[PDB]
Write a protein that binds this DNA or RNA. Structure first.
Ligand code: NA
Ligand code: NA
Length: 330
DNA sequence: CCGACAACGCATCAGC
DNA sequence: GCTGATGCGG
DNA sequence: GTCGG
């Protein structure tokens, strides 16, 4: 990927605009429009000389091209400069960095005078459970996770899961599975042969695992927990007289056996890869989502889901030699 | 011109 | 009390 | 905001 020095001023600009659209104007589609434009320019291996030049890239239109011209000519954007200094808007934008606080809650808080973390700290009674944990670990949640820590975390998870029931199958997905040097969180996909799409499974397969992870003091807090999905916080044990590890976000999903591998594939990504794969899949008469892979009739009537016992199976259906997670950047 | 821009689990709200 | 809608997240 | 039927 091109050095940020090439078009970093532009992409940063587009990303800041993206956040305000999402967090302040509550215009999610404009948020994604800017992100797409930022991503396209980010991978552009040429220092952009004009809006017309950028305009040629998919996702860059008349408005963004116009903004690029202003930025190239003045090193800034008047609209962005103004919004940054706006106390209400900047405060709303900022509060959304707290996990659990979205555009709606941030707007409500600022409306009543609650604009900073300090303010949040003084008003715990106005925060739900999720938001309280988000505040407590605000700093930790923004710190990334080195692969070495991700490995230690995986060791614990795989060990405790097998200890509960050796028939469980757990796979740590996300960028980590693709070999990333760092992660933003840990995503664990869990399944058990007793659990399939059309049958009960003693609705507690997930609970048993969470409970064990809390028992060895790995999982420290719970954001949400149901029969199929758990979202919480975890922390590796600290070393003798050594700086305790920061708290990390961990999600754990229980997926039916027959839908497991479609899930591993999907939650492994990358998003760009999943896009290119779902596309390549369609031109082959197939549609792949998070749960299954289904054919398509002469009209489109996607028949029942096809049997999958591994990732490779999915690749075979669409005649696409199985690609190692390591090579799934796109 | 104007609709799509994903579909979904959990926590919590809105309203009967 | 339950049902559906909304907020939030990844 | 951008795309495309
Ligand atoms: Na374009
Ligand atoms: Na947030």
């Amino acid at each position: 990927a091109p050095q940020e020095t090439l078009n970093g001023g532009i992409t940063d600009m587009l990303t800041e605009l993206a956040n305000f659209e999402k967090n302040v104007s509550q215009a999610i589609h404009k948020y994604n429009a800017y992100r797409k434009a930022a991503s396209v320019i980010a991978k552009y291996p040429h220092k952009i000389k004009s809006g017309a030049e950028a305009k040629k890239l998919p996702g860059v239109g008349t408005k963004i091209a116009e903004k690029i011209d202003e930025f190239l000519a003045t090193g800034k954007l008047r609209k962005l400069e103004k919004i940054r200094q706006d106390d209400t808007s900047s405060s709303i934008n900022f509060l959304t960095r707290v996990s659990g606080i979205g555009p709606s809650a941030a707007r409500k808080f600022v409306d009543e005078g609650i604009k900073t973390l300090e303010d949040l700290r003084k008003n715990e009674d106005k925060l739900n459970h999720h938001q309280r944990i988000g505040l407590k670990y605000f700093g930790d949640f923004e710190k990334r996770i080195p692969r070495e820590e991700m490995l230690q975390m995986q060791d614990i998870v795989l060990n405790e899961v097998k200890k509960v029931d050796s028939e469980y199958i757990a796979t740590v997905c996300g960028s980590f599975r693709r070999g990333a040097e760092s992660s933003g969180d840990m995503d664990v996909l869990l399944t058990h042969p007793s659990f399939t799409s059309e049958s009960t499974k003693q609705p507690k397969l997930l609970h048993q695992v969470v409970e064990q992870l809390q028992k060895v003091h790995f999982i420290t807090d719970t954001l949400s927990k149901g029969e199929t999905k758990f979202m919480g916080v975890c922390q590796l044990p600290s070393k003798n007289d050594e700086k305790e590890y920061p708290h990390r976000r961990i999600d754990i999903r229980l997926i039916p056996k027959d839908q497991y591998y479609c899930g591993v594939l999907y939650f492994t990504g990358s998003d760009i890869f999943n896009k290119n794969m779902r596309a390549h899949a369609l031109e082959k008469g197939f549609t792949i989502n998070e749960y299954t892979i289904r054919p398509l009739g002469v009209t489109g009537v996607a028949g029942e889901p096809l049997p999958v016992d591994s990732e490779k199976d999915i690749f075979d259906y669409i005649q696409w030699k199985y690609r190692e997670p390591k090579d799934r950047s796109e």
